[PDB]
């Protein structure tokens, strides 16, 4: 009785969701898409290599103009790159060298960073003094900072290692809402194209869909076996991809509320560090611990290429907003633009 | 190129100059990771989000990083050594300290990182076994018929009962360390106290031997 009684109600409700998910599975997405021509053999070559970081690169982000790019490393320095002329626009020294994430404002006036210091620091790129100064420090997260993504010049959302995600207001500096429900540490985050929702995978092998305005969880997806290290959102906004430590990518659908595809191979045994889609959503670029990235046919679950140019762990991965290039960072202190 | 893009590249080149002035200044320091429990006396071995303490011995700079499973332990993949502090006085929590040591030794990312083990509070261990009132045998059944201290060098003035207990606890942590690893990393066990000032020398000597046997290995001298 009591909690145990409530335990029977929780188990009964869990079976109802599973029964409803099984009812809608009239056909498999892989079975349905067995009528389209394959994407062929994707062959990408590293156009440029960005040098200057002196330790492992942990995060990277593309500007909305698809030309500027920010990266963070364990030196304690943020470098903004001109991805066309391999020029260093800025070099922002950080107070703490233990930084695991970095972001770029959609307007382009700000960058964010955070890590083991449990603080998201926001830097003003465009100041009258000609330098880069820190604008605000967002404190209130108990654990480390795993991800941070801007919604606009005043709103950012941070996922933390205290099993929570938070929405901040930079003008006030205070936490507006908090997103609770994850059991393990949240490791990734992905804002929807319409920005009204976002998704976050955690170490409890689950991914939750949140509503930013309401502030509570909408759907919960459980198909993985280990910690979900990376998450990314489909360009349409009705699906997302999860990359976990069990050497497998998965594709979940928001409307169907069910898993759609599994991206696995028997000769891959290492974890997945980063995932990203393409402009059309047909490709799925995912970095691994075996020092190279894989290109997956997102509709056919077949490999289509290998981005083998790094001699250490590929830690970050990003695709431009026009789909022209793929930037790949790794623990060998090198960033490579692929095309 | 144009006169504006030529001047932009001159600014970029100056950035790489500053990226190497401080980058070359951080290659002469050794970064250590401090691990342990709350009752271990973790932050009292060296008397000098994430905390950091700096100390220098024999003109060598040391950076000790104390935080506060461990998903952030992969950030310390390139540290010189791991410092694990154990409270050997109490035996109720000695079993969870051994399982504490097992996860770090058999970690996937720390397979090449050596561990300097400080069995802290050895003063209260002597009082707990001389005045008795407790029996490791209760918590560790092997100590009931534990081999007497294996013939070896003991510390002068220590009682035979104290040296029997000290050698038993130190043997548990080296049994885990020698079971696996295949010689890629070595555990260095020490016995400290709360009024011991020599723990800076011991870290210096252990890191000197840590670097020496991997310099000889990657140069294929041994």
């Amino acid at each position, epitope marked *: 009785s009591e909690l145990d009684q409530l335990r029977q109600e929780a188990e009964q409700l869990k079976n109802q969701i599973r029964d409803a998910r099984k009812a809608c599975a009239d056909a498999t997405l892989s079975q349905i898409t067995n009528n389209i021509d394959p994407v062929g053999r994707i062959q990408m070559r590293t156009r440029r290599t960005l040098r200057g970081h002196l330790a492992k690169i942990y995060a990277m982000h593309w500007g909305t103009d698809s*030309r*500027l790019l920010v990266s963070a490393s364990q030196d304690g320095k943020l470098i903004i790159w*001109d991805s066309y*002329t391999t*020029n260093k*626009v*800025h070099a922002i020294p950080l107070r703490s060298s233990w930084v695991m994430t970095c972001a770029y404002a959609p307007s382009g006036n700000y960058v964010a960073c955070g890590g083991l210091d449990n603080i998201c620091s926001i830097y003003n790129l465009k100041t*009258r*003094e*000609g*330098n880069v100064r820190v604008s605000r420090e967002l404190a209130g997260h108990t654990g480390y900072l795993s991800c941070c993504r801007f919604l606009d010049d005043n709103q950012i959302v941070t996922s933390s290692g205290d099993t929570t995600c938070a929405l901040w207001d930079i003008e006030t500096g205070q936490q507006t809402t908090t997103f609770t429900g994850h059991t393990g540490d949240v490791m990734s985050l992905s804002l929807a194209p319409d920005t009204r929702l976002f998704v976050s995978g955690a170490c409890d092998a689950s991914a939750k869909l949140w509503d930013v305005r309401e502030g509570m969880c909408r759907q919960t997806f459980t198909g993985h076996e280990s910690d979900i290290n990376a998450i990314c959102f489909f360009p349409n906004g009705n699906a997302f991809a999860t990359g976990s430590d069990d050497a497998t990518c998965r594709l979940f659908d928001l409307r169907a509320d069910q898993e759609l595809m599994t991206y696995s191979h028997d000769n891959i045994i290492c974890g997945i560090t980063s995932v990203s889609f393409s402009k059309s959503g047909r490709l799925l670029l995912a970095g691994y611990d075996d020092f190279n990235c894989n290109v997956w046919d997102a509709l056919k679950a077949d490999r289509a290429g290998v981005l083998a140019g790094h001699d250490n762990r590929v830690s970050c991965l990003g695709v431009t907003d026009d789909g022209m290039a793929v930037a790949t960072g790794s623990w060998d202190s090198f960033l490579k633009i692929w095309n | 190129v*144009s*006169a*504006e*893009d030529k*001047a*932009a590249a*001159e*600014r*970029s080149k*100056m950035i790489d100059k500053n990226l190497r002035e401080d980058g070359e200044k951080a290659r002469r320091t050794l970064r250590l990771l401090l691990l342990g429990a709350d009752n271990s006396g973790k932050s009292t071995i060296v008397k000098q989000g994430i905390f950091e303490t700096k100390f220098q011995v024999d003109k060598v700079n040391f950076h000790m990083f104390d935080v506060g499973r461990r998903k952030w332990i992969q950030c310390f993949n390139d540290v010189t050594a791991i410092i694990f502090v154990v409270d050997s006085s109490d035996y109720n929590r000695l079993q969870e300290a051994l399982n504490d040591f097992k996860s770090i030794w058999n970690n996937r990312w720390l397979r090449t990182i050596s561990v300097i083990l400080f069995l802290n509070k050895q003063d209260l261990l002597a009082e707990k076994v001389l005045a008795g009132k407790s029996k490791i045998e209760d918590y560790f059944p092997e100590f009931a018929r534990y081999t007497t201290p294996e013939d070896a060098t003991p510390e002068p003035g220590e009682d035979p009962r104290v040296t029997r207990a000290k050698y038993f606890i130190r043997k548990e942590f080296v049994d885990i360390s020698t079971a696996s690893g295949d010689g890629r990393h070595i555990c260095y066990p020490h016995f400290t106290c709360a009024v011991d000032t020599e723990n800076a020398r011991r870290i210096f000597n252990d890191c000197k031997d840590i670097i020496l046997q991997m310099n000889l290995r990657e140069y294929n001298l041994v």
Partner: single-chain antibody, 233 residues
Framework: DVQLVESGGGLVQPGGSRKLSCSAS????????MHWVRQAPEKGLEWVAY????????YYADTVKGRFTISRDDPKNTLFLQMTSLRSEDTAMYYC??????????????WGQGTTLTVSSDIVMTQATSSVPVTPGESVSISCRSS???????????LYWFLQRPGQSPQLLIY???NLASGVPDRFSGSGSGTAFTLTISRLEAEDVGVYYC?????????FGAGTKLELK
């Protein structure tokens, strides 16, 4: 906050030597390239010299090369212009202009006040209009012409617009022929193409009068336009 305080100047004899210094405060002086621009008493602006960040690159006008020298003192937050073998054609007012060069930066933001010196294969910029009467509240367009195509192979058209109010140092309003500077309202709009440019002002309010200078930044030396004065009715 930002200030470029000038020093020196005055009446000097011809054939002598004078040193001009411009003191900088309120910004990171070490990361800004600096320029010297003079204004004749009955003419427009004229670029003189240029020193980069770290003094790694120096450019001179062909009319001052060999007798003028530009240097900067980063720890002291000041720069100097050594002027030797003066003549009667150097009587002008010398401005110190800061300029920073990276992707998306706007050079020629802040112009200091001038020092009144009283000595007792180039792209030309052509502005046919020189004096135009403009009624308040109306809209006018001021054009400029070039002898060479300012559009580069990277897609950047290096044309700049400045406004010298009567009795004040000129200020940048449009840089690279399309981008509005910070603090300049949306009233000003710049547009053009290769060897053809214009500056459109809509709903001309007060304090919009003065002289408008077009400038090229495609190659050194940088040449200014003659100017287009605006007068009240």
């Amino acid at each position: 906050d930002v200030q470029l305080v000038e020093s020196g100047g005055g009446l000097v004899q011809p054939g002598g030597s004078r040193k001009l210094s411009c003191s900088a405060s309120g910004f990171a002086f070490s990361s800004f390239g600096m320029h010297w621009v003079r204004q004749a008493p009955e003419k427009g602006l004229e670029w003189v010299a240029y020193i980069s960040s770290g003094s790694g690159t120096i450019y001179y006008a062909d009319t001052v090369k060999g007798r003028f020298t530009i240097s900067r003192d980063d720890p002291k937050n000041t720069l100097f212009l050594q002027m030797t073998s003066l003549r009667s054609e150097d009587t002008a007012m010398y401005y110190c202009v800061r300029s920073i060069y990276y992707y998306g930066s706007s050079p020629f933001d802040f112009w200091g006040q001038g020092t009144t010196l009283t000595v007792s294969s180039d792209i030309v910029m052509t502005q046919a209009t020189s004096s135009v009467p403009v009624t308040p509240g109306e809209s006018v367009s001021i054009s400029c012409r070039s002898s060479k195509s300012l559009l580069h192979s990277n897609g950047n058209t290096y044309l700049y617009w400045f406004l010298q109010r009567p009795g004040q140092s000129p200020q940048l309003l449009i840089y690279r022929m399309s981008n509005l500077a910070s603090g300049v309202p949306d009233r000003f709009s710049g547009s053009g193409s290769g060897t053809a440019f214009t500056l459109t002002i809509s709903r001309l309010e007060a304090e919009d009068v003065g002289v408008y200078y077009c400038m090229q930044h495609l190659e050194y030396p940088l040449t200014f336009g003659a100017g287009t004065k605006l007068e009240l009715k």
